[PDB]
Amino acid sequence: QCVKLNDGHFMPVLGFGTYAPPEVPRSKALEVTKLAIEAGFRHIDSAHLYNNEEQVGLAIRSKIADGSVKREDIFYTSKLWSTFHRPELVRPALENSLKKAQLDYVDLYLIHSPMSLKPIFDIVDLCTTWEAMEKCKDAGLAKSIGVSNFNRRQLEMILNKPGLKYKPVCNQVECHPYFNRSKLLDFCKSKDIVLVAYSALGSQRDKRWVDPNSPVLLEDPVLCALAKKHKRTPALIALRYQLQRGVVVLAKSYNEQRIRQNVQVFEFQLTAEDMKAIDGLDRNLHYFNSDSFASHPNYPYSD
């Protein structure tokens, strides 16, 4: 089920992650997004950067056309890529995403990252980008607007903007038991901003971005022991951890069995001692860790 956002709309608390790397054929996103909807997912997370909005959109329209769901039962997110932070570019970028997906609106549009790129880094006052996001909500192109990859200071930037019209409903950020974002979660909760966790199953470990020496979250012994205790799986422990701390959680799978398994997160719960054991895993490990952005001026992890 769902959480009420600070603008009055509702967001399902489990979301289907749609990114797959370039070597995966583009048609696969169609197949797996249809399987997700069948399995029970109602929140679908995409982005311009994912080069899959056409296929993800066709999956959603297909499941509407066969009568499985109504458009209003689906919560679709897209994201403004970082070459489009200049405010005059924000509405056209969102209109392009809508045209690719063949939708009239997105349920949620995010600023994908604070790290602006040449429309090579760019310097852009993200307050101005945010005003343009607000106009997209006023026009009905996005029911809700939010940000992604912002740290506390960068969110405060927006919350403290003179003439602010809409707070971000959410901040979608890397978050899992090795990097659990407790303090940022407490700050988001204090401002009625939902934290949405990505790489909640430990990421896809892409060689472009992730050190292969980094520990593999789903092989963690504490998670494996809890999975045995509950006769579930390490992935389900990881997802359930997030729901119990009030985090909305995404889960990418392009495998039919695991897609179906991930919806079991609703079927069990963890005790306080389990939760404390998980919280014990925090080690400041963001799987994104590359020179390609660690040196950006708005890199979020420099705080």
Ligand X SMILES: NC(=O)c1ccc[n+]([C@@H]2O[C@H](COP(=O)([O-])OP(=O)(O)OC[C@H]3O[C@@H](n4cnc5c(N)ncnc54)[C@H](OP(=O)(O)O)[C@@H]3O)[C@@H](O)[C@H]2O)c1
Stretch that binds ligand X, among 136-144, 178-186, 251-259, 289-297 (CB under 6 A): 251-259
Least Cα distance to 297 among 162, 155, 115 occurs for 115
Cβ-based burial of 160 (10 A; exposed 0-12, middle 13-18, buried ≥19): exposed
Of the residues 19, 41, 130, 150, which one makes contact with ligand IMN according to CB under 6 A: 19
Stretch that binds ligand IMN, among 60-68, 229-237, 257-265, 293-301 (CB under 6 A): 293-301
Amino acid letter, 16: F
Of the residues 106, 251, 288, 298, which one makes contact with ligand IMN according to CB under 6 A: 288
d(CA 198, CA 277): 21
Residue 248 binds ligand X (CB under 6 A): no
Q: Is 198 annotated as a binding residue?
A: yes
Closer CB to ligand IMN, residue 19 or residue 109? 19
Least Cα distance to 144 among 124, 121, 169 occurs for 169
Known catalytic residue at 166: no
Site for ligand X in 158-187 (CB under 6 A): 172
d(CA 274, CA 213): 27
Other beta carbons within 10 Å of 273: 8
Least Cα distance to 188 among 107, 265, 126, 248 occurs for 248
Site for ligand IMN in 142-201 (CB under 6 A): 149, 174, 199
202 interface partner picked from ligand X, ligand IMN, none, CB below 5 to 8 A per type: ligand X
Helix (H) or strand (E) holding 146: strand 142-148
What is the 8-class DSSP label of residue 274? Answer: H
Stretch that binds ligand X, among 15-23, 66-74, 115-123, 135-143 (CB under 6 A): 15-23
Residue 121 binds ligand IMN (CB under 6 A): no
Annotated binding site for NADP(+): 18-19, 45, 148-149, 172, 198-204, 252-254, 258-262
